[PDB]
Scaffold this active site. Structure first.
Site, PDB file in Angstrom:
ATOM      1  N   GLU A 240      38.146  18.794  65.324  1.00 35.81           N
ATOM      2  CA  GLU A 240      38.559  18.294  64.011  1.00 35.81           C
ATOM      3  C   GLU A 240      39.434  17.061  64.161  1.00 35.81           C
ATOM      4  O   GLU A 240      40.245  16.954  65.087  1.00 35.81           O
ATOM      5  CB  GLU A 240      39.357  19.332  63.210  1.00 35.81           C
ATOM      6  CG  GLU A 240      38.645  20.585  62.731  1.00 35.81           C
ATOM      7  CD  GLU A 240      39.574  21.466  61.926  1.00 35.81           C
ATOM      8  OE1 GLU A 240      40.691  21.009  61.637  1.00 35.81           O
ATOM      9  OE2 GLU A 240      39.214  22.602  61.576  1.00 35.81           O
ATOM     10  N   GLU A 289      38.207  20.026  49.211  1.00 41.90           N
ATOM     11  CA  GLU A 289      38.004  21.453  48.989  1.00 41.90           C
ATOM     12  C   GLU A 289      39.090  21.988  48.051  1.00 41.90           C
ATOM     13  O   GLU A 289      40.122  22.499  48.492  1.00 41.90           O
ATOM     14  CB  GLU A 289      37.972  22.222  50.321  1.00 41.90           C
ATOM     15  CG  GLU A 289      36.759  21.907  51.226  1.00 41.90           C
ATOM     16  CD  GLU A 289      36.796  22.659  52.577  1.00 41.90           C
ATOM     17  OE1 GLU A 289      37.205  22.067  53.622  1.00 41.90           O
ATOM     18  OE2 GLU A 289      36.448  23.870  52.592  1.00 41.90           O
ATOM     19  N   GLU A 297      45.610  19.898  51.504  1.00 46.47           N
ATOM     20  CA  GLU A 297      44.403  20.439  52.093  1.00 46.47           C
ATOM     21  C   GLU A 297      43.183  20.314  51.164  1.00 46.47           C
ATOM     22  O   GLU A 297      42.088  20.759  51.515  1.00 46.47           O
ATOM     23  CB  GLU A 297      44.631  21.893  52.516  1.00 46.47           C
ATOM     24  CG  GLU A 297      45.736  22.062  53.554  1.00 46.47           C
ATOM     25  CD  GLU A 297      45.345  21.521  54.915  1.00 46.47           C
ATOM     26  OE1 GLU A 297      46.223  21.316  55.770  1.00 46.47           O
ATOM     27  OE2 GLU A 297      44.153  21.243  55.120  1.00 46.47           O
TER      28      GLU A 297
END
Ligand SMILES: *[C@@H]1O[C@H](CO)[C@@H](O)[C@H](O[C@@H]2O[C@@H](C)[C@@H](O)[C@@H](O)[C@@H]2O)[C@H]1NC(C)=O
Length: 316
Positions: A240, A289, A297
């Site tokens: 990531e 998201e 986030e």
């Protein structure tokens, strides 16, 4: 080529089938998923998209049973190997034997990895599907200067045999690596250009090694730590890396666009410790998201939900 992580935790994302199409359209040839989602697995058939298949932390205990691992490999891997290009299986994500969130799981990781690798090997897929685990760098206790890189002493019992295991099967170590969070936590000592790959001159001298960016500094600190723990021949796959467009300090559109465009260019080559070889990297992540917590986030998306790129990146 760079890969992209496909997180699905939003209420407004395109249907799975469209996300795969959108990968092909954009010429993204590597994908990471975090569970063996059937729809995604079915949608990747003939896609030629190389896959990191994740074992969810929640399934680790179960998979310490060999028979349970055998059936997991049957259902989620062998059931698709005809048409899905498995590259790595990520057994657990960000597990630490000393972090509150995952400490009670550390015991399970290596046994799961062994059972899964055994099953993979029984199926004769061991030169194709590399079993590994994805760490964060909370396990690195010291990283400045990068040559001084060392794992925290209190995780060596955990890490040592896993490093050893990976060496015997010739797997890389998977690492989530975010110069963003480092910078955001300490903008006083870390300069923004350093974090963004925009520094014209060297910023850190480590003997004969000049560090221009935080990513190189951070990766090389990891390599040094592996070297101290008898894993000096392990490759690191960056599983990531991303920069958030909003939601917190230094989470901005401009910072986002710079970091990711420069990262894509940077990883065609290596670090001051390993300068030649390209660094395999999975960008985090395809879509924002909106169900995740906290606020920041929700902004790691590379794409808006209308499937338009935030930043206009070339993935080829
Ligand atoms: C998708 O990315 C890969 C690199 O990972 C590029 O090589 C692809 O370009 C195509 O394949 C190469 C080998 C060459 O034939 C070129 O002419 C092709 O365009 C790239 N695909 C596209 C469509 O850009």
């Amino acid at each position: 080529q760079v890969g992209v992580c496909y997180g699905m935790q939003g209420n407004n994302l395109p249907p799975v089938s469209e996300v795969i199409a959108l990968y092909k359209k954009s010429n993204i040839t590597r994908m990471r998923i975090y569970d063996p989602n059937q729809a995604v697995l079915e949608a990747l058939r003939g896609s030629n998209i190389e896959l990191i298949l994740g074992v969810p932390n929640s399934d680790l205990q179960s998979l310490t049973n060999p028979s349970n691992a055998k059936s997991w490999v049957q259902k989620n891997v062998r059931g698709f190997w005809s048409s899905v290009r498995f590259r790595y299986i990520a057994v657990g994500n960000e597990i630490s034997p000393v972090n509150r969130g995952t400490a009670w799981l550390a015991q399970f990781v290596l046994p799961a990895m062994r059972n899964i690798h055994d099953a993979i090997r029984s199926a004769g897929l061991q030169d194709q599907i590399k079993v590994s685990t994805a760490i964060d760098l909370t396990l690195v206790g010291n990283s400045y200067p990068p040559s001084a890189g060392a794992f925290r002493d209190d995780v060596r019992s955990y890490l040592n045999p896993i490093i050893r295991f990976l060496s015997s099967i010739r797997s890389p170590l998977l690492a989530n690596i975010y110069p963003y969070f480092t910078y955001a936590g300490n903008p006083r000592d870390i300069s923004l250009p350093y974090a963004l790959f925009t520094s014209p001159s060297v910023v850190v001298w480590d003997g004969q090694r000049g560090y221009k960016n935080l990513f190189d500094a951070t990766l090389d600190a990891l390599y040094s730590a592996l070297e101290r723990a008898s894993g000096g021949s392990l490759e690191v796959v960056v599983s990531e890396s991303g920069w958030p467009s909003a939601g917190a300090f230094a989470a901005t559109f401009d910072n986002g666009r710079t970091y990711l465009s420069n990262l894509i260019q940077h990883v065609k080559r290596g670090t001051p410790k390993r300068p030649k070889r390209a660094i395999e990297t999975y960008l985090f992540a395809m879509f924002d998201e909106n169900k995740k917590q906290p606020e920041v986030e929700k902004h790691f998306g590379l794409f808006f939900p209308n499937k338009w790129q935030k930043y206009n990146l070339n993935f080829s």
